[PDB]
Structure formats: structure tokens, C-alpha cells
Design a protein around this ligand. Structure first.
Ligand SMILES: [Cu+2]
Ligand SMILES: [O]
Length: 444
């Protein structure tokens, strides 16, 4: 090969990635100009690596997904993508905006992307994105079944569960290192539902005609053909920064195999380079940062319980009697034993208590979603996620996958810390789902 490693150029001012909503019209104007000139290369220089289609093919070429390589790959991906945009308009400080879908003011479709006849527009998008509707951060392809207020409440609860509760340590945030999918918190939710919510409905008839397969954002191979793809991933990249902001155990993976993993990218001059994961840990050392923006989901630890008291775990079947579960056709409840109870804080400091669902199997072309609750029964209202019992959710953009949930916070809030056995309830929302086994392990 002999391709050199990337040399960081000299860094003048920091590039500032701003929120996509209510951006000034002059910013939108040159963002459209950069994209327009990127798309022109599809015609004038189809094999130029910086052109629109060739950049889209980076996602459609790159096992980088459902692994701990998810965040660093897309950071480097967007790093060169942002540099290409700035260089096409002679703007060396151009910042790639981020779709602020974790903030109530950024949860609508960003207006700048919905202007037909502009370079940022894409007709291959779904219909539920208009009419001033809020995004559904737990979308599985259907229309929202709740009020917009409950939708907002669920969105912010999902953010809290995904950025705080279920990502207390690096491996659960970034993902894991076979066909078993080991996605982290964010790559599952809200990353996957945003793709689903923006894309066309699978089975629908596309522009002209083809049966849509979810193009553009809702299908993995064509997602890069929507300019909004990069704006979404800008906020995904921002989630990495916001996750580390509170310190403690939420730091970068220190494993040498992860740090020294390499990717391949062409820079804005069309020159090939190898890049290391260890060299993208600090965005400011790559020449960019995010505009400081409030994160109100940090305050959405649920304050109420769905059900008072404790479930009688003797009236429900044990995990050993339910799994392997051939089909999660409806809500089911089961008891499960904990490795230890009455844990001290020094034990919690060492090992997280993790509820793990093993061998989630389904057809990778179907929309999949199920929710997990502790200490409820089969009649739990799964539309109300702002409850102390809501643990998390699994979704999918035959596949085999794993879901891991950090439950120490819930055990404290619900009052189950001295219990050796607890109740778990699975609520399916979409798809044909089988589950091989469920366990509570004390992890890293
Ligand atoms: Cu994505
Ligand atoms: O992605």
C-alpha cells in the first residue's frame, strides 16, 4: 500500500459546527453552494473522490457498524467531508451544522433542508416529517401514536436513558469489538430511528417508480445521497463530546486494539491517507468544536412510577421457562435472578450491573422495536416512557444482535436494591422477534 498517515494541517481558528435550526440565511446560502459544487463533480469528474456520489459511497462501502468503530469512523468520515465542503467555496472555517434533535427547539425537520429546488433538498424523504411534526426518536416506521407533548416527553426520556442511564462506561456507549451485532447505545437509539423517520416508507413507490426500499435516509446504501445524512451524523458526533463532558467513567476507550485501529480516507485534495482512532479523540485537535448548546435531557430522570409497590415474582415464570423465546408476539413478563444484591458503592464503581438480551434474531429487512420495563406487568402503557420502570429499547435500521441495559439506576429508583429476583417485561412494537436468552451479569 505505502499510503502515508494523515498530517493535521495548520489550525487557525476552530471550525464551529452550529445547530441546524434557525441558522442565518447567509450560512444556508453557502452551505447550499458547497453541496451544489460537490454534486457538480458527479457529472464533471465522476471518479473524483470528493464528489457527492463518491462521498456517499464511503458509507455504502464501509464491519464498521454495530461495533465500537462506529463513532471514530464517522468522525473521520465527517472530518474530511467538512473540509471538502469548505474548500469548494474557499471557506477554510466552514462548520458542518448539526441536527439538534436532542433539544426541543431542534426536534422538527430542519427547515433549510426542506426547501425544494435547493441543493440541500431531497425528494426521497418520508411524509411524516412535515406539518411541523416533532421527530420520533423511537420511530420504527409508523405514524406517531401519542400526542406531541407525550412524544416530546418520550424523546427526552430516550435521550436520558441512552446518554446517561445505559452508557455509564465506554463499552456500552461505543459498542463492542461473527454475525452477532454489538452496537452501543446511540448507534441503536436515537441514531437508527432518525434514519427511519426521514427516509421514505419501505414498500412505497418512489419518485418516478420503484418500490421504495426506504431511500434515501431509511436505507443504508443510499443514506449518503441525502445531504441531511451528514447533518444528522454531525449531532451523532456531538453526542460523543456531550457524553464525555461529565467525566468520571465516561471517557474514551483505552484499549490498544481500539486506539490503533485504522481507516482509509481521501482528503479534500484527493490524496489518500490512513488515519488512526487514537488521533480523533479530541475534536479541537482536529480543528473543530460544537456551538455550546443546552442539553435538557440531562434533567429527564423520570420522577414517577407506573406501578406502585413490587411485582410478585412468584406469579410470573422464570427466565429459564421463557427463553429461548421463539416469537415475542405480545407483552410478556418474567422473573430473573441477579448475580448479587445489596451492593455497595465500591462494588458499583468496579462493575456495572448489566441486563443483557442474547441472540436477538429477526429478518434484517423488517422494522424491529421492543421496549424493556422492570417491575411492571403485561398491561404496562408502553407509550409512556417517562416512568422509573422504563429501562430501554432495541431497534433495527437473519440478523443476530445483543442489547445491554445498565440497571443499577433503576434498581435504586424503584427500590429493588436488596432483591435477589426482579420482574422484567418485554413489550414488542414492531417486527418478528425471537430472543435466545436473558442474563444479568456484573461487568467491566
Ligand atoms: Cu447513520
Ligand atoms: O450511518
Amino acid at each position: 500500500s505505502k499510503v502515508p498517515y494523515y498530517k493535521f494541517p495548520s489550525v487557525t481558528k476552530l471550525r464551529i459546527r452550529p445547530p441546524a435550526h434557525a441558522l442565518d440565511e447567509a450560512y444556508i446560502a453557502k452551505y447550499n453552494l458547497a453541496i451544489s459544487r460537490m454534486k457538480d463533480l458527479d457529472k464533471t469528474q465522476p471518479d473524483n473522490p470528493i464528489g457527492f456520489k463518491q462521498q456517499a459511497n464511503i458509507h455504502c462501502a464501509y464491519q464498521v457498524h454495530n461495533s465500537w468503530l462506529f463513532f471514530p469512523f464517522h468522525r473521520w468520515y465527517l472530518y474530511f467531508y467538512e473540509r471538502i465542503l469548505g474548500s469548494l467555496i474557499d471557506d477554510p472555517t466552514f462548520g458542518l451544522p448539526f441536527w439538534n434533535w436532542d433539544h426541543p427547539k431542534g426536534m422538527r425537520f430542519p427547515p433549510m433542508f426542506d426547501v425544494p429546488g435547493t441543493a440541500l433538498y431531497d425528494e426521497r424523504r418520508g411524509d411524516q416529517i412535515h406539518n411541523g411534526n416533532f421527530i420520533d426518536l423511537g420511530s420504527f416506521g409508523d405514524q406517531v401514536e401519542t400526542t406531541q407533548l407525550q412524544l416530546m416527553t418520550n424523546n427526552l426520556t430516550l435521550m436520558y436513558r441512552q446518554l446517561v442511564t445505559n452508557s455509564p462506561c465506554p463499552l456500552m456507549f461505543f459498542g463492542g469489538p461473527s454475525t452477532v451485532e454489538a452496537a452501543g447505545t446511540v448507534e441503536n437509539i436515537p441514531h437508527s430511528p432518525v434514519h427511519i423517520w426521514v427516509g421514505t416508507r419501505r414498500g412505497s413507490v418512489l419518485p418516478d417508480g420503484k418500490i421504495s426500499n426506504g431511500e434515501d435516509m431509511g436505507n443504508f446504501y443510499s443514506a449518503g445521497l441525502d445531504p441531511l445524512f451528514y447533518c444528522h451524523h454531525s449531532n451523532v458526533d456531538r453526542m460523543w463530546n456531550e457524553w464525555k463532558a461529565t467525566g468520571g467513567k465516561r471517557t474514551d476507550l483505552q484499549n490498544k486494539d481500539w486506539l490503533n485501529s485504522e481507516f482509509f480516507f481521501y482528503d479534500e485534495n484527493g490524496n489518500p491517507f490512513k488515519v488512526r482512532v487514537r488521533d480523533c479523540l479530541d475534536t479541537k485537535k482536529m480543528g473543530y468544536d460544537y456551538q455550546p448548546t443546552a442539553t435538557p435531557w440531562r434533567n429527564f430522570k423520570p420522577k414517577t412510577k407506573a406501578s406502585a409497590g413490587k411485582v410478585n415474582t412468584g406469579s410470573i415464570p422464570p427466565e429459564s421457562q421463557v427463553f429461548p423465546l421463539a416469537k415475542l408476539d405480545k407483552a410478556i413478563s418474567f422473573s430473573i435472578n441477579r448475580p448479587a444484591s445489596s451492593r455497595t458503592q465500591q462494588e458499583k464503581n468496579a462493575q456495572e450491573e448489566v441486563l443483557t438480551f442474547n441472540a436477538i434474531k429477526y429478518d434484517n429487512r423488517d422494522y424491529i422495536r421492543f421496549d424493556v420495563f422492570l417491575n411492571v406487568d403485561n398491561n404496562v402503557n408502553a407509550n409512556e416512557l417517562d416512568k422509573a420502570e422504563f429501562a430501554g429499547s432495541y431497534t433495527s435500521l437473519t440478523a443476530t444482535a445483543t442489547l445491554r441495559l445498565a440497571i443499577t439506576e433503576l434498581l435504586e429508583d424503584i427500590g429493588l436494591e436488596d432483591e435477589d429476583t426482579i420482574a422484567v417485561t418485554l413489550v414488542p412494537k414492531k417486527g418478528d422477534i425471537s430472543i435466545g436468552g436473558v442474563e444479568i451479569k456484573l461487568a467491566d
